[PDB]
Copies of this chain bind each other. A is one copy, B any other.
Amino acid sequence: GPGFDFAQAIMKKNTVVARTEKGEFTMLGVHDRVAVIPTHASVGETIYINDVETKVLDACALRDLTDTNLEITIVKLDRNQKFRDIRHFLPRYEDDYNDAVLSVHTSKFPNMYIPVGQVTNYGFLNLGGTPTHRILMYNFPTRAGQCGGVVTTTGKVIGIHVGGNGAQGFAAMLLHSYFTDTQKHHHH
């Protein structure tokens, strides 16, 4: 069966509702005060988190070595609570998955769980006119309002929802190495 309990434990401890100029997004918190949001949410220097205006201390829009959009933005937030560290639930590598759940946490839908079925490593996607890499595809008619939703199987947090064409949904991958403690680059 689909891993509803796992999905629910992630939603309960590791999501917040985030709101930018582009609207509301489910927001997965990963560790400390670091979270993710689709790049097309256009995060600026402040964001609403559960309706509380919040400084965005850092925002990194991920791109691969071909200089292509990965559609993940990692944000660091000025808030008091630390997120439970869920980095050990992130996959090490690209992969296909079975029987995944897509979980949403917005004002309209404070917790909703959608079994999306099989998830395939899809690769290239033209996302609203933006070439994008490292996409996961599921055959489910996902909708507006579901962006940022968390895609899990039991024991793994695998992506966040970023797109769909009416029949399929698409998630940007999460990989363990996006979040490993590291060294010193000038990045802005």
Contact = CB atoms under 8 A, between A and B. Distances in A.
B1 A115 contact: no
Interface string A36-50: 000000000000000
Contact of A112 (B2, B4, B8, B114): B114
Interface string A138-149: 001101000000
B108 A115 contact: no
Contacts of A109: 114, 143
Interface residues of A, number: 16
Number of copies: 2
A169 to B, nearest CB: 12
A109 B114 CA distance: 9
A64 interface: no
A97 interface: no
A146 to B, nearest CB: 10
B140 A110 contact: yes
A43 B187 CA distance: 61
A111 B108 CA distance: 17
